[PDB]
Amino acid sequence: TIKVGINGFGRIGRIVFRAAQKRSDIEIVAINDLLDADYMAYMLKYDSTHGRFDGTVEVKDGHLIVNGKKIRVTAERDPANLKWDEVGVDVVAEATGLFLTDETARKHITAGAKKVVMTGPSKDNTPMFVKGANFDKYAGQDIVSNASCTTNCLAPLAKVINDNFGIIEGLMTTVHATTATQKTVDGPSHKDWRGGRGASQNIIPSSTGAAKAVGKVLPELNGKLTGMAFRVPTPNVSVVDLTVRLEKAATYEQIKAAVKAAAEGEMKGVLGYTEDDVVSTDFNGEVCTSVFDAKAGIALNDNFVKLVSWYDNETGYSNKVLDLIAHISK
Amino acid sequence: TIKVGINGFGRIGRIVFRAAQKRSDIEIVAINDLLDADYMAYMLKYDSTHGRFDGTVEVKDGHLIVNGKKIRVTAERDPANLKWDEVGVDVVAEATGLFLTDETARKHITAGAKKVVMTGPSKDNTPMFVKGANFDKYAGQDIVSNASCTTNCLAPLAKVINDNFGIIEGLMTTVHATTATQKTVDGPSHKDWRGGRGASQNIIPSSTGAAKAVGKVLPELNGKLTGMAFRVPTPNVSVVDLTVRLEKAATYEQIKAAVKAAAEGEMKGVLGYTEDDVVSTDFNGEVCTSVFDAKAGIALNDNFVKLVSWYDNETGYSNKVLDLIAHISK
Amino acid sequence: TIKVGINGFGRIGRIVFRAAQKRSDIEIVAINDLLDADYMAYMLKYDSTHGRFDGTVEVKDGHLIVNGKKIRVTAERDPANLKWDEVGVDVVAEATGLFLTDETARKHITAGAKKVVMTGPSKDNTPMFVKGANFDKYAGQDIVSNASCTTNCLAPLAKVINDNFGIIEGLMTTVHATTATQKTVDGPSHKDWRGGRGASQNIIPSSTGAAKAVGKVLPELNGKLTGMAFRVPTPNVSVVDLTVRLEKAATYEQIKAAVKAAAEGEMKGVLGYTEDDVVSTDFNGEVCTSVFDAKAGIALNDNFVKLVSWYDNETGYSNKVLDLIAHISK
Amino acid sequence: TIKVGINGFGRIGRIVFRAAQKRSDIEIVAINDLLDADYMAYMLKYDSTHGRFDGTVEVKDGHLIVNGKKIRVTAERDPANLKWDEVGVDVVAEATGLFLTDETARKHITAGAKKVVMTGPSKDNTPMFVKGANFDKYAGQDIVSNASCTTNCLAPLAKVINDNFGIIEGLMTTVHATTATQKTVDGPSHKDWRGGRGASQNIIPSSTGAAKAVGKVLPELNGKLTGMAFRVPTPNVSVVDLTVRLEKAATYEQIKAAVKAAAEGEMKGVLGYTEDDVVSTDFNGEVCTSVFDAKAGIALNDNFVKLVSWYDNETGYSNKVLDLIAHISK
Ligand SMILES: OC[C@H]1O[C@H](O[C@H]2O[C@H](CO)[C@@H](O)[C@H](O)[C@H]2O)[C@H](O)[C@@H](O)[C@@H]1O
Ligand SMILES: OC[C@H]1O[C@H](O[C@H]2O[C@H](CO)[C@@H](O)[C@H](O)[C@H]2O)[C@H](O)[C@@H](O)[C@@H]1O
Ligand SMILES: OC[C@H]1O[C@H](O[C@H]2O[C@H](CO)[C@@H](O)[C@H](O)[C@H]2O)[C@H](O)[C@@H](O)[C@@H]1O
Ligand SMILES: OC[C@H]1O[C@H](O[C@H]2O[C@H](CO)[C@@H](O)[C@H](O)[C@H]2O)[C@H](O)[C@@H](O)[C@@H]1O
């Protein structure tokens, strides 16, 4: 197995942890964050969104025992001090949100790890990879990024549409669940004033680099897509609303058929396809990073259409972080 | 003053009632619904969304006294039996949702009213009117419709954009507050399965005829716009997200300037314009039916842009119902 | 197995259905409600609160096939016309909310059923039974009631406390999740004005007969307990807050120990006990009808204490409906 | 007028500011917090809970002009450096939550203020005062505390009940709106694990010192009251549920009459009384710190009763902070 250390035990770190338990190719052997082992165990056991942990959790000698396996727990602020080699870590899932450059993340490698996956968009030239879009472009780099949840939804769908019909131009909106960066009542948010406004009370316009980041994982789409977000009062699951103008005429039936073909073929397990009367909670726990909603989309004409795709912004992204870890470890 | 009777005391009937109190051109003299006078008074006095009624409410002899004025209260199922002439009603605000055809609505005129305004889209050829779009096309008809809240947001903005730059084609999404037709927990909704799913828990895709209805109030846009909705867990205020391809190149600055010009001129009081860091609650109580959000929109290029406009789906629409009543009574 | 027919496919009918699938003593063979088979299948498959159905659902020839078993689907308004004998139904779970008297419910027996369990408090002298409190008092009656969800939480806890320390008097509050009887925005609720007010926006005081109904399943407590409710904006899981004056002095530790003893003994599977830092979502899916929260309670002194117990108002109650069906079928 | 400086521009600081505008006895002349003047102006202008500021707000030369009055804006971390004498501040409203002892708060007086009101419970022996309970006990002290919002609700009601009927013992629950200390999704809360759980998803048991603090403002009740809280998914307005055993027999009618008498007399403007079918949003903006809900309460017998009283945890408390400022400045 690939031995993995998780840096940061926020929503992504904890859902990565849960998603890892079912895999045979990877084992989590260590977690680092500014939390006691007892508090870590509590956060793992009980989850408002995803329910009780499926398995056993005990604290012994200041470390965790999960499904009978020992997991080293540390609280180091400085990544260079993590002593990853002491527990034989191969790959670090870097999930704090604080170390999204080569200089910062590389400290994991100084500390004994072989490779690092950032669980957010890199802030420098560190390459990004999105399953279904460009895992095949991985070129042995020791530090990589899995981009963001919204990019993991938009890119696989954009690729299918562009490959079959040619995207001339597109504009995207994500209607996005509330996240940890938001506030329960109007409070300070110096760099994002709207995002400080009470989350349960409001539809809140927000920026997203996702559509543009698609141009990084799919260079053929560079400059052809951009977008924005609205944060709304749900605790999880989000939806992409993609409006595109197409080079080749395609009826809505042709579009449905092309997406369904991908979902059952090349992009199975990444891209999903439904014709059911679904709502966001139907995707709580969804592993596919993009589930096309056939009945929700609408075409104005054969060259101008609005497509709708769901994503569990916690679960899909977290599973694909693990997919990328396995991928770079081949 | 124009004497008005309200049929139906649901959200629109009650907010129409409140909005009328500040006007000098119109007086509400009668309300009909299947509710006691005491229960009517209760629903008027206390409102979760809009706060306490600003004024006095008393029940006397089975009727209402509001701000010292007597208001006849009846509970007739059959519009033909409403005896509107007995209280000198000029115009009926038909707000039950049940009488959206000429045959049904005309019964108000049989009962002694002179004209009728439906507070929803007509279901037959009854003409629709939207302030800012086509009030000037009113041709003395005795029964009319004020269309819907979403159409009142989309049409004024669409007209400004089309008049200045030429809309080749557009697709719209409304991110829309929860309404009375929805359910608190998953329950039966035979004709709209998704709309039966628990409203506080879900983003729910929903249909809307609004974009197409724009083609009815602005014939020049017939066939060029369509759209869809997502219902989200907020109790009021919604937002239009309009993606358009333009005939004439226009920078985002040109677009902002054109909307601001309308908001300060021809469409003052209908179309609004802001550059502030607003969120949906900032429009709770908004009287403009469309408030353009400059900072939230985004252009991909000079001919392809996404525009954002807010509307209080209760208050703006209700004020414009009254505007239409005054308009047809000139 | 006991063959069961469900009348009414609302929240209780559907969660009863799901909870039955794991049992070996009971099989659901028929469902009746004013819903198509296709719509029934949809409501079974997708649940906002409890996630996707664990198993297979198909519609064939206007009936359902669930986990490979055929289930007759009908839409009869009149219980006497249900033809329960045609599918060999032993016991009816009467979950419509409409037939809570002997006269009405007995029509199930005229139609060929042997016994009936109402899934709500009876409205006449039909006896009520609550597991942990008085199943042992069942005396072969053909029509019974499982009381209500709140009574199923309060009664087992009240019995433990009274049996060990003697309840002189108590007053209860339930902080209760939003239910189907409530409204998404302020709307008509002629017989319960507060309960018509928008559910997602409000704390709403509400009546409950639960504390008094305890006096029916535990006659020794008749007249000694009453209470009230507050409905709050959560979609499921509620909590009892019970304030009692005790005859025998008992420290809080003694109280904890007595509840834990019951939870591990006589009342295992009915009454639960936790000392963890739990919140309501931690009980979504809880099968125990009452889970005592040790850390949340507080004693003023050895004879006056406030005790806190959680219940999943859908799941616990539904499992105990099935328990009562098995019990009366012994 | 009394010149007031506000330290901290969180929910209490901002609602204090708004509530001050209508007063003639007090003027706010200065605000200090780690926020730009432009950001301060934004937070003042738009409020999700209380709507748009009623008046004018401009930023000039790095300070604020509000309703035509200049307000000095500073960003000093150290209270001793506040230079309150430079703007002639008489009293400081200390609303940061960080300086709740004599040592810390007194630094405002070193910096030129004459007196200080903490807008939260003191953490040392600094005396607390609650209008309706013990303003009359103020003995000229230069540093005081207005206690907490829950204490301002419980104490006036407790005093009326005790003065008329004698409280032998009581236990209180507050069902309390979400606050700024809570989290939008499950996140770290090292000293309060439950309070880190997602606020919009959960009923969350929480501690409160309020009932015990009543014993500080009303020494006759020392040791006779304690309580707990449940935080629920509403953005504002909370409710006290007080269960008391009484020395003198009192029917519920006697209790209602005694509370109504206080609300119309000695405690007018502090304690309110309603018999209407109210819900929490009906108190959004409520100035009374305790509004008795006659119809919601319930008596088991003449000596054991549960009483219900509403409070806008932002607005009532903030108005009474100002009342205390005026009181100590007499
Ligand atoms: O930080 C000072 C600036 O705050 C706002 O801009 C931030 O917040 C916006 C959302 O409200 C973001 O779109 C923007 O990218 C942030 O920079 C304010 O709009 C600016 O004018 C202030 O300078
Ligand atoms: O009423 C039977 C049909 O119900 C669904 O379709 C309705 O509900 C949809 C939203 O879930 C609407 O979009 C649609 O317009 C309604 O007709 C179901 O999708 C259909 O297959 C059923 O025949
Ligand atoms: O139906 C007319 C009555 O409505 C109210 O009372 C109902 O609603 C209350 C909750 O708001 C319930 O407590 C009460 O049991 C219901 O009867 C109103 O309070 C009454 O005065 C009206 O007569
Ligand atoms: O900080 C370590 C402790 O955390 C919890 O206790 C805190 O959180 C509780 C609410 O979950 C509060 O009631 C309590 O007062 C806090 O101290 C945990 O319950 C403790 O066992 C941990 O030691």
CA dihedral B121, B123, B129, B134 (to 10 degrees): 120
Active site residue D149: yes
Bridge partners for C198 per DSSP: C183
A193 in contact with ligand 1, CB cutoff 6 A: yes
Question: What domains can you pick out in chain C, each with its CATH number?
Answer: 1-147+314-330 (no CATH), 148-313 (3.30.360.10)
- Residue identified by tokens 């208050």 is B315
Interface contact C46-A285, CB threshold 8 A:
no
CA A292 to the chain's CA centroid = 17
User: What would the two tokens of residue D66 be?
Assistant: 């509000």
Nominal resolution in Å? 2.0
Which phi-psi region, left, alpha or beta, contains residue D224 (left: φ > 0; alpha: ψ -120 to 50)? alpha
What's the rounded Cα separation, in Å, for the pair D40 and D21? 16
From chain D, the residues in CB contact with A48 under 8 A are 185-186, 197-198, 201-202
User: What would the two tokens of residue C256 be?
Assistant: 């904890």
A46 touching chain C per CB within 8 A = yes
What's the rounded Cα separation, in Å, for the pair A137 and A161? 20
Please report, as a single letter, which amino acid is at residue B84. Answer: W
From chain A, the residues in CB contact with C276 under 8 A are 42, 45-46
Which phi-psi region, left, alpha or beta, contains residue A184 (left: φ > 0; alpha: ψ -120 to 50)? alpha
Active-site pick, D149, D172, D199, D244:
D149
CA B52 to the chain's CA centroid = 21
What's the rounded Cα separation, in Å, for the pair C312 and C236? 7
What's the rounded Cα separation, in Å, for the pair B122 and B144? 8
Judge contact between B43 and C186, C-beta under 8 A.
yes
CA A82 to the chain's CA centroid = 24
Residues in Cβ contact with C191 at an 8 Å cutoff, skipping those fewer than 6 apart? none
What's the rounded Cα separation, in Å, for the pair C182 and C198? 8
Give me the DSSP letters along D19-38.
HHHT-SSEEEEEEESSS-HH
Looking at the partner chain, which of A180, A188, A198 has a beta carbon nearest the beta carbon of D185? A180
CA of C189 to the centre of ligand 3 (A): 9
What's the rounded Cα separation, in Å, for the pair D238 and D286? 11
CA C110 to the chain's CA centroid = 26
Distances (CA, A) of B185 to A128, A293, D98, D233: 41, 22, 42, 16
Bridge partners for D128 per DSSP: D145
B205 in contact with ligand 2, CB cutoff 6 A: no
Judge contact between C240 and C174, C-beta under 8 A.
yes
Compute the Cα dihedral for C4, C9, C11, C15 and give only its sign: positive
Pairing of strands D69-74, D26-32: parallel
Q: How many CB pairs under 8 A join A and D?
A: 92
Give the closest ligand to the alpha carbon of residue D274: 3
Residue D119 assigned to a binding site: yes
Pairing of strands C167-177, C238-246: antiparallel
What's the rounded Cα separation, in Å, for the pair C203 and D203? 12
Backbone angles phi, psi at B133, to 5 degrees: -105, -50
B194 in contact with ligand 2, CB cutoff 6 A: yes
Residues in Cβ contact with A60 at an 8 Å cutoff, skipping those fewer than 6 apart? none
C48 touching chain B per CB within 8 A = yes
Residue D269 assigned to a binding site: no
Judge contact between B195 and B187, C-beta under 8 A.
no
What's the rounded Cα separation, in Å, for the pair B324 and B320? 6
From chain D, the residues in CB contact with B51 under 8 A are 281, 284-285
What's the rounded Cα separation, in Å, for the pair A97 and D299? 54
Please report, as a single letter, which amino acid is at residue D233. Answer: P
Residue whose C-alpha is closest to residue B281's, from D113, D33, D236, A31: D236
Give me the DSSP letters along C120-162.
S--SSS--B--TTTTGGG----SEEE---HHHHHHHHHHHHHH
Cβ neighbours, 10 Å, residue A100: 18
Residue B67 assigned to a binding site: no
Chains sharing 3 or more CB pairs under 8 A with chain C: A, B, D
User: Residue A249: is it exposed, middle or buried by C-beta count within 10 angstroms (0-12/13-18/19+)?
Assistant: exposed
**Minimum CA distance residue for ligand 2 atom 10:** B192
Judge contact between C269 and C190, C-beta under 8 A.
no
Helix (H, G, I), strand (E, B) or coil at D297: coil
Q: Which residue on chain D is closest to A204 by alpha carbon?
A: D48
Backbone angles phi, psi at C171, to 5 degrees: -135, 135
User: What would the two tokens of residue C271 be?
Assistant: 């009454």
CA C245 to the chain's CA centroid = 27
What's the rounded Cα separation, in Å, for the pair C199 and B267? 37
A43 touching chain D per CB within 8 A = yes
What's the rounded Cα separation, in Å, for the pair C172 and C254? 21
- How was this structure determined? It was done by X-ray
> What is the gyration radius of the CA atoms in chain A, in angstroms?
20
Helix (H, G, I), strand (E, B) or coil at A272: strand
User: What would the two tokens of residue B297 be?
Assistant: 């929109």
Residues in Cβ contact with A329 at an 8 Å cutoff, skipping those fewer than 6 apart? A2, A90, A91, A115
B286 touching chain A per CB within 8 A = no
Pairing of strands A238-246, A304-311: antiparallel
Residue whose C-alpha is closest to residue A189's, from D74, D197, D61, D34: D34
Helix D149-165 to helix D252-264 angle (10° resolution) is 120
Which phi-psi region, left, alpha or beta, contains residue D323 (left: φ > 0; alpha: ψ -120 to 50)? alpha
B300 touching chain A per CB within 8 A = yes
Looking at the partner chain, which of D232, D243, D277 has a beta carbon nearest the beta carbon of C175? D232
Looking at the partner chain, which of B34, B180, B198 has a beta carbon nearest the beta carbon of C187? B180
Backbone angles phi, psi at B275, to 5 degrees: -120, 10
Interface contact B234-A239, CB threshold 8 A:
no
Bridge partners for B322 per DSSP: none
Residue whose C-alpha is closest to residue D168's, from C300, B269, C220, B264: C300
Judge contact between C48 and A236, C-beta under 8 A.
no
User: Residue A52: is it exposed, middle or buried by C-beta count within 10 angstroms (0-12/13-18/19+)?
Assistant: middle
Backbone angles phi, psi at C155, to 5 degrees: -65, -45
Q: Which letter, b or e, does each residue of B71-110 get, where b requires 16 or more Cβ atoms within 10 Å of its Cβ?
A: bbbbeeeebeebbbeebebbbbbbbbeebbebebbbbbbe
| Ligand 4 atom index nearest CA of D191 | 1
D205 in contact with ligand 4, CB cutoff 6 A: no
Backbone angles phi, psi at A300, to 5 degrees: -80, -45
Residue C293 parent element (H or E): strand C290-293
Residue A163 parent element (H or E): helix A149-165
Cβ neighbours, 10 Å, residue C301: 14
Judge contact between A167 and A161, C-beta under 8 A.
yes
What's the rounded Cα separation, in Å, for the pair A155 and A317? 13
Residue D321 parent element (H or E): helix D315-328
Q: How many CB pairs under 8 A join A and B?
A: 129
∠ CA D36-D317-D284, rounded to 5°: 90
What's the rounded Cα separation, in Å, for the pair A17 and D263? 57
Q: How many CB pairs under 8 A join C and D?
A: 129
CA of B38 to the centre of ligand 3 (A): 11
**Minimum CA distance residue for ligand 1 atom 17:** A191
Cβ neighbours, 10 Å, residue A146: 27
CA of D201 to the centre of ligand 4 (A): 20
Active-site pick, C143, C149, C161, C259:
C149
Residue A72 parent element (H or E): strand A69-74
User: What would the two tokens of residue D29 be?
Assistant: 């002349």
What's the rounded Cα separation, in Å, for the pair A66 and A56? 6
Interface contact A46-C282, CB threshold 8 A:
yes
Looking at the partner chain, which of C39, C182, C184 has a beta carbon nearest the beta carbon of B179? C184
What's the rounded Cα separation, in Å, for the pair C251 and C171? 19
Q: Which letter, b or e, does each residue of C8-46 get, where b requires 16 or more Cβ atoms within 10 Å of its Cβ?
A: bbbbbbbbbbbbbeebeebbbbbbbbebebebbbbbbeb
Interface of A with B in 256-285 (CB under 8 A): 277-281
Q: Which residue on chain D is closest to A198 by alpha carbon?
A: D48
C302 touching chain A per CB within 8 A = no
> What is the gyration radius of the CA atoms in chain B, in angstroms?
20
The minimum CA-CA distance between D284 and chain A, rounded to whole Å, is 14
Residue B149 assigned to a binding site: yes
- Strand D91-94: give its sheet, edge to edge: D57-60, D63-66, D69-74, D26-32, D2-7, D91-94, D115-118, D143-145
Which phi-psi region, left, alpha or beta, contains residue B152 (left: φ > 0; alpha: ψ -120 to 50)? alpha
What's the rounded Cα separation, in Å, for the pair A273 and A285? 16
CA of B192 to the centre of ligand 2 (A): 5
- Residue identified by tokens 């999960």 is A66
From chain D, the residues in CB contact with A236 under 8 A are 185
What's the rounded Cα separation, in Å, for the pair C71 and C79? 18
What's the rounded Cα separation, in Å, for the pair C27 and C17? 9
Q: Which letter, b or e, does each residue of D84-95 get, where b requires 16 or more Cβ atoms within 10 Å of its Cβ?
A: beebebbbbbbb
Looking at the partner chain, which of B202, B224, B304 has a beta carbon nearest the beta carbon of A171? B304
What's the rounded Cα separation, in Å, for the pair C81 and A207? 59
Distances (CA, A) of B305 to A225, B190, B252, C141, C193: 11, 37, 8, 71, 47
- Residue identified by tokens 């042995």 is A140
Residue B33 assigned to a binding site: yes
Chains sharing 3 or more CB pairs under 8 A with chain B: A, C, D
Judge contact between A78 and A104, C-beta under 8 A.
no
Q: Which of D34, D35, D39 to mutate to test the pocket of ligand 1 (most atoms within 8 A of CB)?
A: D39
Pairing of strands B167-177, B225-232: parallel
Bridge partners for B244 per DSSP: B170, B305
Cβ neighbours, 10 Å, residue A191: 6
Bridge partners for B59 per DSSP: B64
Judge contact between A65 and A58, C-beta under 8 A.
yes
A205 in contact with ligand 1, CB cutoff 6 A: no
Compute the Cα dihedral for B230, B232, B238, B241 and give only its sign: negative
Looking at the partner chain, which of C35, C49, C193 has a beta carbon nearest the beta carbon of B42? C193
| Ligand 4 atom index nearest CA of C295 | 13
* Helix ranges, C116-275 (H): 149-165, 210-217, 252-264
Backbone angles phi, psi at B65, to 5 degrees: -120, 110
C304 touching chain A per CB within 8 A = no
Indicate the DSSP class of residue A254: H
From chain A, the residues in CB contact with D48 under 8 A are 185-186, 197-198, 201-202
B52 touching chain D per CB within 8 A = yes
From chain B, the residues in CB contact with A167 under 8 A are none
Interface contact C280-D228, CB threshold 8 A:
no
What's the rounded Cα separation, in Å, for the pair B122 and B114? 18
CA of C194 to the centre of ligand 3 (A): 8
Residue D103 parent element (H or E): helix D102-105
3-state SS string for chain B: CEEEEEECCCHHHHHHHHHHHCCCCEEEEEEECCCCHHHHHHHHHCCCCCCCCCCCEEEECCEEEECCEEEEEECCCCHHHCCHHHHCCCEEEECCCCCCCHHHHCHHHHCCCCEEEECCCCCCCCCECCCCCCHHHCCCCCEEECCCHHHHHHHHHHHHHHHHHCEEEEEEEEEEECCCCCECCCCCCCCCCHHHCEHHHCCEEECCCHHHHHHHHCHHHCCCEEEEEEEECCCCCEEEEEEEEECCCCCHHHHHHHHHHHHHCCCCCCEEEECCCCCHHHHCCCCCCEEEECCCCEEEECCEEEEEEEECCCHHHHHHHHHHHHHHCC
3-state helix, strand and coil shares in percent for chain A, rounded to the nearest 5: 30, 30, 40
